[PDB]
Symmetry: D2
Subunit: 451 residues, 4 copies
């Protein structure tokens, strides 16, 4: 059902609990953009699950044993040994976070004319691919773009779409396949092991490389153990190890499923690409022996990755998010289904049907959510999407992203009860109008006002 | 109505979570005594709320700023300034925990042969009083001894009983009145402000001193704000300050409402007694500048005491315990009422009516609770009562209970549901619970080391 | 010679560096009593080596793994296993510090008429002995009371004095022998292994118990390895284990050679006395599973005791103190000889020969030391000693007590150079006059003024 | 004259301290390359002063108060307020370390084909400049290239060389002047305030921007207070603020003079460039609210930067390095002069005159230094210079040196004596030092992974 936290609270973080009238003032000062809210003014911060996790006592013990040597740090040897043991890859290069590893991989495996195809995309990953002269091709199955379609493993790659790309464009013009686990843009949807095995079968026949975006791979591994038949007797670690056996490398953001506040790494099996990675990491991140991370942070990441393999931890992590989604779904609140491993996405298109998409319903829904409850959420609709056009995506959603081991079921009830009350008078949600807008990346800095 | 935690989780503590068949092995290795269980084998440890609290990020920041000087530590000045500000007492002496401060007070304010009267007693406090030649007299009102009587402020002192003591026994023969907030032995029951004022009024008329046992004074202050009329507009800090304005001093166990894992102190307003307190703390605890505590621990206690004054914290603290008690009461599980500020007491006599008290139902109920849920609780019945010194029979108490003591800021409502659901399932087939028989029994304090086996 | 610190600095403590004119004001506000100085106003705090030590990264890692359970804490099992391994005793009871263990032992092994004899005494130890109705008898050899006599192992017990006590008073009237390692009052002087072996031989023949005051036992073990023939091939741990094989138990203040800021314990081999110790620790310290200590503090003490067995640590610890004494002795400054393991004692009797003992030379020397350098020292002459008399001891000294791993050789040079300059114009040191004096323990609270 | 540490040791780091015969084994396993040594096998690690510093108790207290929010973290506001207060710049963007900020600045202020001129260069800074289509021009005064010339402020820019560049190359074709304080490649040599003012005067007349490489700016500020007339009455903070008043921005590696183990930031006054900086930091470092750093690390850097402004700290920092250099110079050991703010450079060409540069004397000297003392140092000569891209021969530099880089607040004078005494003993029989020959050599960056064997 909904198991209790498989841990005790070792230490707590003090938070401000300003009343509604105070929160309304803070939201007005922030231009009705949740990205501009001060952390000190937020009760429950569901903006992202990236780097906001709570570490364990064992991780903080490693923090006291930081070997800050520039080369040969014991923390690096611990992290290297851990990733090689759990992921199975031959070579590891630490980076300060995920997009640092993406910067490395995109410069190492992309020729300025090749194609990169994957199960949807992420902002930072696609930028570095296109920065290095690649053209992105989405080969996820079409069901992944249907927010309400409740089917299992929506992140699976359409093998027919991949076969079409290899035929129409040729394998020589395909840089690599970028398989993401889980698929963040589809709502945190998992990829099945049979899909990873089938993708590896087709790519290996044409000499195409496969690189994983593994930031939420542990959450993906739980869905395999829970819903894919034949993996019920397999541990999380066994599933994680089998997942990466169908890849030539991976980029990892430790800030997610490694249960840390900073850190990432790049993995690969090819010796020659590892040599070029060590030469390139020096100018962007640092030495291959620390890669832009303090020694204590490599230690915390090595310990956190091993803690993520505990079944009871990852079961509670996913089922806490599912509890929030189930409570909203039972009250009639429209959400993306099925609930992903790391967040619940409110479908602002259905939530705010009385508002047009030019009126920023997701942004206005996120602003109202904070004022009524003190809960911060991230707009993931047209504004995040960015001639002189608006650019309209199918998904006008508000993301309630759950940090790991930070909040309780009672905190989820505060989020649910407030959204449910807000939904009961959803007609009151007003539209927004732009005040100041940069280019490139406007979701972070734009300001709005009620219409 | 059961608020969410007024804080986030900064860091977590790893637990093993062994399955039921493994927990049965651990319980058998522990002789069916929860006191002999290893901490590493316990999912939810409700043995005590003493020193088991979770500290805040600000407290751990103070832990990094420990001034470990033997004298004149800045951490002591911060603790001294904090207690003088919040409690109002003139002089402070730190101790390593509560019973260290009780050892000092009992030697400073008791002449051999005098009487000490209080709203019931505690084990360590009464020992140091009687060790120094005092005779304890219970002056709590009779309603406190009714486990099922659900009334407010059961810890209040019966003013007539105190008046009777002053009349039958000379006031010169009364060492002091020991007012405890809350009253742990009655189930964590609070004392009203009107009672503390009346006690201060009566004792001041006869020159009698009043010293508070304030280990859970903050929980007591919340009950005043919630249930005593006239205090709804007053903050927790204002209530705490008014409480101690009716006392000449106090002994504090910081391990409770100061939100720390170690620490205590002794307070008083009398200059002459403070001089003797500084001379006596040297031989038992340490210098008056640290009193058996590391500097970082005085800092954490100074910060934690100020954090306890937050209304939202203490409201959630009390209502989390109340949530556990209400869920048990709604399922028909017999508990001591009303629910105290820090624990829920299962009535093991009614829970295990098919067992006699010679069969240790509370001890057997605690063992089954761990096996079914991984929750450790404390037996508070015949085993804890011990044996009589001369006749060598069982000290048979009216209360055969199992104490579910909640550490502060450590567990969630979901953890309380684990405790409730397991006890409720165990209660639905309570007839299966077997009795226990001694297989090893020490000479004194038997709850800690005794071993048992099923009958 | 004088080896470098066998460790690196992991973290530093910020200290105030007020000028001389500021320090003079602070000293006047403190009534010229170094005990009343604020820690924030002191550059180098040499008041005591008790609880002022710097812990290691491994100890602070254990601090993050505090098992704060009331019973069955893993930290207790670590501490118990460590002491049983290194000391060899069968039973251990943790206490909040040394005088807590002394309170326990004195109530368990003293009948209100028996004698307690030891190599000199300490204030807290002798109080609890006399509190429980014992009469103290000093059986240290007479050479220990000669501050200038530079001989080895001045802390040895005079076997003839012990034989005289057993004959004149009988073994039935002797509670136990209290052997202290090292002897703090004699200047931190060590006890030889042959002495501990000979004492055990004589006491066992008469059924007398031997209990060690082992607060500085590791420093004692180094002197055995350095100066007693036959122990040069033996490690510190082997020497420590052999030392306690000649004792029935011990009281330990972890605040000394366990490299912690709080903590102690009581050891013994007798099962029946251990049962009574567990009953008595409950009313004074706490449960036998934590004994008035947080779980993290038991962990830090278990780790610190194992770190103390490293030869390079304890060699540098002793030789840093010796460096201070050698630099003062080479300049003509009168000190207690030989230099002990934990402190250097300035002989204020020779330092201030132009002042009488009624003028508190040690107290006035300590006050002047702070004003000129910002160094705090402890007066250990007549004032510490306390009819209506003054009570005159042979030793009018000023103790420069060195915390472990806290200061460097450069800090010792600041102490030495300032004392040497002060000694060159020692005639300027003025006498003191009492302003306010309590009874029982007057060194802590008394105030003075210049004459 | 060599002051004592202006602080106490709060906590220590455990070291192994293996004997000489064991260290020889470790050095052979590392192919006689100090870069391949394990940190656990090193007594004194003088490889770099970057990110190896010891933090204070106040910094570790801030580490416990990490606000790990993705946006609007209080730690960012503290860092932003601190840099704006101490440096005077209008806008701040955090980065994970210095070369992250250099990556941003090079893409923001360089159009392809422009010139970048500075007082010598650094490896990472020059790479990002040339990666973005710039041509580097050295405008340091000629005295900086004389290793033995003991003069003050060798890092000053030759104003005539800058005037010549503006004349021969149009000012529109000059991206910016990159003024580094201190100059690491010249041995950590400082830049005078009069030079920074003259550079600002000349560049402002032609509309040219000036950006500082300020990683060791605090050490530079001490040299101004110590050796430049007119600044003896000014505090370190006042000097730092005046230095940056002659710049339009800066790139900072907090891993140096901010007393942290990770962190950096990018500063500027131009509003338009700051808008582009926030857009570019997202794809490389992270949000402008954390920029690739944990919240606790921004807090530690904010606290450490304020601690670096203490005169007594930075005086001891510089004079501890000077103590090592003076002890070597007094024994006849050849070093680069004057001693820089952060390291001492051994002249391995003179130290090992019996060896040719093809025999890697600096690499062989570093290996012997570790075997005799357990001290790791960095080879800074022919091996670090690498090979030419086309012809494939050795890049032969004038400086064949061994760098003894001192982390801040990590070691004592006794540790410096260990370094000096071992090098002095090694110098007394320097003829025994053998040459090295390649047994494994990578394709690029060979100092890190290459292996050697004795000839
Ligand atoms: C699937 C996947 C991710 O979700 C991911 C980061 N997610 C993020 C962080 C983010 C990044 C950009 C704008 C807003 C928020 C999330 O808020 O969801 C990265 C980058 O890793 P990094 O942030 O550690 O560099 C790679 N792949
Ligand atoms: C040999 C020996 C000791 O030296 C010792 C403490 N020394 C102390 C501490 C102290 C105690 C009383 C007055 C002043 C200073 C020292 O400053 O030198 C204790 C008590 O242990 P505790 O302080 O941990 O209770 C037992 N034996
Ligand atoms: C009202 C009151 N006053 C003083 C003290 C002593 O303070 P301290 O010395 O413990 O800090 C306590 C201790 N309460 C704990 C711990 C305990 C104590 C004895 C036996 C078992 C467990 C419990 O109630 O379980 C107390 O409740
Ligand atoms: C003046 C100056 N400006 C910028 C940076 C980059 O900053 P960051 O990215 O390192 O934080 C540095 C790095 N200095 C270190 C570390 C190092 C760097 C390259 C090779 C080996 C070692 C050293 O000098 O040894 C620097 O000195
Ligand atoms: K973070
Ligand atoms: K505790
Ligand atoms: K201390
Ligand atoms: K580092």
């Amino acid at each position: 059902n909904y198991p209790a936290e498989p841990f005790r609270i070792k230490s707590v973080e003090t938070v401000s609990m300003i009343p509604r009238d105070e929160r309304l003032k803070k939201m007005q000062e922030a231009g009705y953009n949740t990205f501009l809210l001060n952390s000190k003014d937020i009760y429950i911060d569901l903006l992202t699950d990236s780097g906001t996790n709570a570490m364990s006592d064992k991780q903080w013990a490693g923090m006291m044993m930081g070997d800050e040597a520039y080369a040969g740090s014991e923390n690096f040897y611990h992290l290297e040994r851990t990733v090689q043991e759990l992921f199975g890859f031959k070579h590891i290069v630490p980076t300060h976070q995920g997009r640092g590893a993406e910067n490395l991989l995109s410069q190492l495996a992309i020729k300025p004319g090749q194609y990169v195809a994957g199960n949807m995309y992420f902002t930072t990953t696609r930028y570095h691919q296109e920065k290095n002269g690649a053209v992105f091709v989405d080969i996820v199955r079409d069901e992944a773009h249907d927010a309400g379609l409740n089917i299992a493993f929506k992140g699976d790659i359409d093998l027919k779409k991949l076969q079409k790309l290899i035929d129409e464009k040729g394998a020589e013009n395909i840089a690599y396949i970028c398989l993401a686990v889980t698929v963040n843009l589809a709502g945190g949807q998992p990829v099945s092991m049979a899909n990873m095995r089938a993708v590896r079968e087709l790519t290996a026949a044409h000499g195409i490389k496969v690189f994983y975006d593994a930031t939420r791979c542990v959450e993906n591994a739980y869905f395999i153990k829970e819903q894919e038949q034949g993996f019920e007797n397999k541990s999380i670690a066994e599933i994680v190890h089998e997942m990466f056996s169908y890849a030539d490398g991976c980029t990892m953001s430790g800030k997610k499923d490694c249960l840390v506040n900073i850190g990432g790494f790049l993995c690969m099996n090819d010796d020659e690409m590892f040599s070029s990675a060590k030469e390139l990491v020096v100018v962007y991140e640092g030495m291959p022996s620390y890669g832009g991370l303090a020694g204590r942070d490599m230690e915390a990441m090595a310990i956190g990755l091993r803690e993520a393999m505990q079944y009871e931890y990852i079961e509670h992590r996913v089922k806490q998010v599912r509890y929030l989604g189930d409570k909203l779904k039972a009250a009639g609140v429209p959400i993306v289904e099925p609930v992903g491993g790391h967040a619940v996405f409110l479908d602002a298109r259905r939530f705010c049907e009385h508002l047009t998409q030019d009126e920023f319903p997701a942004q206005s829904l996120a602003a109202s959510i904070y004022v009524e409850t003190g809960v911060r959420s991230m707009e993931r609709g047209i504004i995040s999407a960015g001639t002189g056009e608006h650019h309209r995506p199918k998904l006008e959603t508000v993301r309630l992203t759950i940090p790991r081991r930070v909040y309780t079921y009672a905190h989820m009830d505060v989020v649910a009860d407030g959204i449910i009350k807000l939904y009961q008078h959803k007609e009151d949600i007003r539209g927004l109008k732009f005040i100041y807008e940069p280019k490139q990346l406007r979701a972070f800095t734009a300001r709005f006002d009620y219409i």
